[PDB]
Amino acid sequence: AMITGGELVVRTLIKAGVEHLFGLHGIHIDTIFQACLDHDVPIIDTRHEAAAGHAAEGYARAGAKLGVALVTAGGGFTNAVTPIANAWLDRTPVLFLTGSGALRDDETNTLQAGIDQVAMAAPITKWAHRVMATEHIPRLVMQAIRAALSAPRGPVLLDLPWDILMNQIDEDSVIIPDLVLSAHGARPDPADLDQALALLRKAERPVIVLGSEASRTARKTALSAFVAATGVPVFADYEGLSMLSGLPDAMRGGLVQNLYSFAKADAAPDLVLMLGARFGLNTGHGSGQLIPHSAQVIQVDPDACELGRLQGIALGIVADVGGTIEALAQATAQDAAWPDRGDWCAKVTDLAQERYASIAAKSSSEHALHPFHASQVIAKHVDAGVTVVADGGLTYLWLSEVMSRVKPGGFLCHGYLNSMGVGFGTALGAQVADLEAGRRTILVTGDGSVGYSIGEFDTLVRKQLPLIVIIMNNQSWGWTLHFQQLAVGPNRVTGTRLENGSYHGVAAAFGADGYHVDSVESFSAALAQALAHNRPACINVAVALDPIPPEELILIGMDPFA
């Protein structure tokens, strides 16, 4: 028959293995909407394009697969910029399909047309391109997919002029190709794999730090066989945590942010193995905090820029992180000459424990519900059947203190962009990935960050998504209000207080469950209540503002343990 370019897009995505798209409708991309309707593909349609974009991210992260986002021309695309920017830095594999002006209505001042979407998207994407001919649609779509999913994973834009989409050709003119890209990643040269193992055996205090790319390939069975052979502790940046949930408990060092007072302990790691973790913000930069200059560092990253960009390393290998762990278990299933790491692993869990006691010792929840305490109520329900998504300022800095101790099904936190509010978006789409697994999603967000996408309680309800939103309400933009007294001066705070409005009143008005809580018990009663029930909820949690997280004081450059 004769199908439209819109249909050609959809066949190609179905051929890849795509089963959900997140989007918001426009006349310009309606041919895709029509084709999805025809091929029984869900198109979760949100209230803001950005929220749909982040929804694709969360699906991609929580799902360990490709996320797809669909936005209309002009305003559709520009509303989509923040999720693209976010997925760019988080290294999140998301295909962004956008409509634009008709080729033939080029340069005529028509509606939603005239802005250079690929130009805009270029410095934010692994690849961005505008389709010039309908026959190109199947192969350009697959190309776009391949680029996003290969290492390092990242966001890709495909600009589908209205003109090309509506247009129609003969089904036989064109070939819908398969996704013919191996699921297995590239492995290091046998020469280096041996040198890195030789180094790890000589190590007295060795550690491994997992990055985002450990989670995208998700090679758990091979990682377990490897830790089970060498017996070395394992840390991760935020994205990496999901991986540490198949590991014995003494071999779990937790969040990379623990390796801080390992110096002040005369116990600083002897060697560091970085698999996908970059010398960015999550690893304490080139400063030496979490990773020590003295230490001999082995860094694996598909992207050779990252190889000792900030510190000098000892060995740097270009390869896929997931494909590397496979090559690691394989070469460690004959060794058997691996030292006992008891005394080392012992202190690792000890130092993490001291921090947990040191914060619980500082926590007074006498007058207003301390935030470190509230996070514990949440900790109580976190296991492999629960994806946790974090947003807000101080509120996610408090969760990190409680997150090393539990074993989550997914954990999705801020990337280098650190854009407040992308929480709803990411969380929503996370739940759609979690529906298959039976996992349930919980968003822990700030009173500020919820305001960005508050309308999404509508989408939650319309699409029947049982996401629980916990709003840690301190009646302010938390992180910034602290900066104002702590970096500027006590009496002068502006543009940061948010002392107005029932967020729970909003959610109830949008059709979701309202809960209001201020005490520890009030909160635990409500969280267990919302979890028991199988529909969307909002919990407005009154927390103190004054308390200063240890992580806030690390990042400006001070010791919270001195």
Add this chain to the structure above:
Amino acid sequence: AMITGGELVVRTLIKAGVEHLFGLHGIHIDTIFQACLDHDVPIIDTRHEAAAGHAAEGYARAGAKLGVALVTAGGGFTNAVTPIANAWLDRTPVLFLTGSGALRDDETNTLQAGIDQVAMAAPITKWAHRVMATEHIPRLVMQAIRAALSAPRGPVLLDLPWDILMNQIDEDSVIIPDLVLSAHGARPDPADLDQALALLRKAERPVIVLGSEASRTARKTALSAFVAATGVPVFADYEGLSMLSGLPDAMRGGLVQNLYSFAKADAAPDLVLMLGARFGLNTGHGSGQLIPHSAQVIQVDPDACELGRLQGIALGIVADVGGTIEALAQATAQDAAWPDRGDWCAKVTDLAQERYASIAAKSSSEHALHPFHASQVIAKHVDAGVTVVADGGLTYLWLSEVMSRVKPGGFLCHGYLNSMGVGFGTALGAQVADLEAGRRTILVTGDGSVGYSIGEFDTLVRKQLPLIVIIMNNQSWGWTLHFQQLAVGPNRVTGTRLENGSYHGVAAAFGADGYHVDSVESFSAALAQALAHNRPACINVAVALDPIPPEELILIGMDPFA
């Protein structure tokens, strides 16, 4: 004494004459926040950076001045992109002040940093530029203002590294320089102005069409001098309508879209003078449905691409629209012999009025409130004491049909980008520019577009803004659903129905007045009620889905009077 890069900016904006900024606080730009506090200059902080940017647009357009927008690094900037794009196409003079990563922490994977902000805004701005030394700030800020304000007016982006903002210097070492740019625009060469007036005299059915740029300089008394002398009617595209409000009633033609039904009456304009109107969406592209190919066209635009871009004109002048009007009055003051236009002007008002009676005659509001009947209820409250702001899909297309009859102090509608939801931001900042002038602002929005910025009721209450928001709620993304049922098929509707949620409840949750009305009486009661009170209000108006606005059928290329 010693100053910081932030202070330098604030002093430079004050020497320009700026009295409000719209922003959203982040630590990267806190320096400006602090300097503003010192100088009693208000920063209206919203819930989303987008809403802030659009608020600067609304400030600018309704204020006939520069609108200033301030956003933080990274997510702060990318969230502000929809406002920049809109400002670009609307030709709206807005200065966009963005923070970025520190210069000394360049290329290190730090926080909110690594996205090429200037590159991203390049295709959307008259000028984009990242500041490289703290002493450059005062002259780089002024150069940005001049860039923004010169014709054609447009957005300008100025990236201030955090490094450079926090950074510190001597008061007398650098110079806060003055705003030296003449307010009066450039005039056509007299030989061309004479060609034009000669042409205008010989015309049998002459019209004038105003664009954005007429409203920007706002030379009202020079238009009245010119119309009341040649006696020619005057039309305007959306941005230009504000300018027709101090004009004699007979020589007002209304919105440029009334020139449709002018052919079928053998009364198509003989000559068309276009002052800032571009050929494109507002003026019926190159089709000659509005501007007939037969007519002698005279076009005046600051930007030369624009001159006869889609049609052939007889005269194309590069000049300021504002200054061209001044010359049009100048050259008309001695000229005694202008023909009588009484019969033609009678014909213009006659054709426009037949249109109105034709719509009312086809409008039943018995089963559910007709969107037209609803639009009339609003129009009876519109005079020069009111700025009406429009958003949504079908809802604004209906409102246009009543807007030609009333003389508004401001009318801010969709530009070419047609981004749904920009209504809140613009409407908010419009109310800020309106407070000083004493005028009151109404936003007339659809049920879809309001969901975009619905947390902004928070800003409406925190900041004490008596903005009334009418939601024309047809429980669907109206305009796209009409495309789906009319051009694809009645049973093929997906992703456009919005069958959920109390919007008036949402406003009531943030502390605004809630109204839910459905009949003509109820709504008029509700509107008059909210207007009496100096308070932020939300009117949720239940309106019909089925009716097709005459503009929907015109823009698709059909006759709606057939």
Add this chain to the structure above:
Amino acid sequence: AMITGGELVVRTLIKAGVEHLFGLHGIHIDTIFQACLDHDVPIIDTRHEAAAGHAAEGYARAGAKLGVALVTAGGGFTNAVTPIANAWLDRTPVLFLTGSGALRDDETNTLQAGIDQVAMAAPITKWAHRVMATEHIPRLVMQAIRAALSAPRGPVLLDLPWDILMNQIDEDSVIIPDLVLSAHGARPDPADLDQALALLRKAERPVIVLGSEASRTARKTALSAFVAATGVPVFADYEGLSMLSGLPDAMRGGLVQNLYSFAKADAAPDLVLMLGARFGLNTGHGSGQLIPHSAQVIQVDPDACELGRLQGIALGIVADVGGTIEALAQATAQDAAWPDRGDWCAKVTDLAQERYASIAAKSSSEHALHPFHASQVIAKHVDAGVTVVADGGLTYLWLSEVMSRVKPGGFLCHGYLNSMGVGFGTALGAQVADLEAGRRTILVTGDGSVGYSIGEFDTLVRKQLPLIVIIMNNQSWGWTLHFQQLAVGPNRVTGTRLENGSYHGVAAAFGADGYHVDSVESFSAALAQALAHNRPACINVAVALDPIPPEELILIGMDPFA
């Protein structure tokens, strides 16, 4: 019949009045070649696309019209970058027509395809754009011409995919539109015009400075009437010098660079009138050496960025420079009472003349011909019938000192880009424009610079172009060798000597008249010889290296006088 997209281009250029192209043939752009050959418009085909690009600049600047460059896809476009860049900063109206890959051969790794040609040209052009439809060619080309030719004049890039160019439509289906854009530019307000004149009347030591845009619009008759009425002296940067050749000699201040030693004379100008000169390289920046801080500045520029960008000004008008000179003569036709400026005019020509003898006084041509003495030889032939083109390092810094006194038909020197070797290109194109005027072109280049485009002697020969090329050969990259010893150290000069080659031998091996000269008499004799002959000539002049252009010392910030 049916014509080609190539034909559609040529028909449109023809309607603009384009009578010559500069280019270099590729198969992608052959349809334009066929259409030019069909319609007898000459395409001057050079040996390098950069020479073709620059030749178009010279044609534009020397003919005071639009210039058109035509380069093929890929290498054709990239070779064209330096001319586009130069035209951008010189403000030169140049249409760049480029081929690119076939739309339907998109992303297929083909011949000459794949490089984002509009992206690369975006920051270098007023407008860069890829043509998307064969129907579009006529209106897009004219839109391009309008954008290049509007104030401020600058280069435009039009990308014409080979696919769309080969395409064939029906003649009658598309309309080849006229150039309807008034040749007179916009004039200043009459409030401001009068303020400037009253300020000019109150002035005690007023001066006028013409910049690039004065030569573009070329409003000579209006300038003669204006200086001859107020009697104020008049300077110019390099581009502006051509206009000073229709002026009584005492009223000629010459090159703007004379106003240097005017301060230490207590003769620093009271008031400065800037017509299109920008605060920058030619005008001693924001430093106030040439354009004093004490003095009141009145600045007129099409681009408002420029208005007091580096100094504070007293008045700043957005207007076309050509139009402003008109308005000025106009307003001076009634103004009978302009004071006598005899005392000031005399002082001016006196100081410029003293500086001149000050250099001849310190010049010795005994052991090798002095570069200034050599410059004087050339000055003896410069009149209204000669276009002089300068290139090279020291060699042109020497001419400037001799150039103020003589009144040339054209004078084309380096723009802000200051790119060596662009001489042949610009000069060759200059000679083509000069054929209509009867003027002859003479290029003064250095030994390093001729080296860039040396093969162009071949184009001079094949194409019968009697351009005379004087090489001031000091067997080195002069300017950089001087920086090395004068700012770095005596004994450390590397990579700057060019002690090799017969340049005259090269020109003769290509077909042109070869001359070798080292003394004053040899040089004057041969220069006079090649001029009598109506052929292309090369003159290789051995000049001294050790000398030091006063300008070379006026730019590090030091003083070549007191």
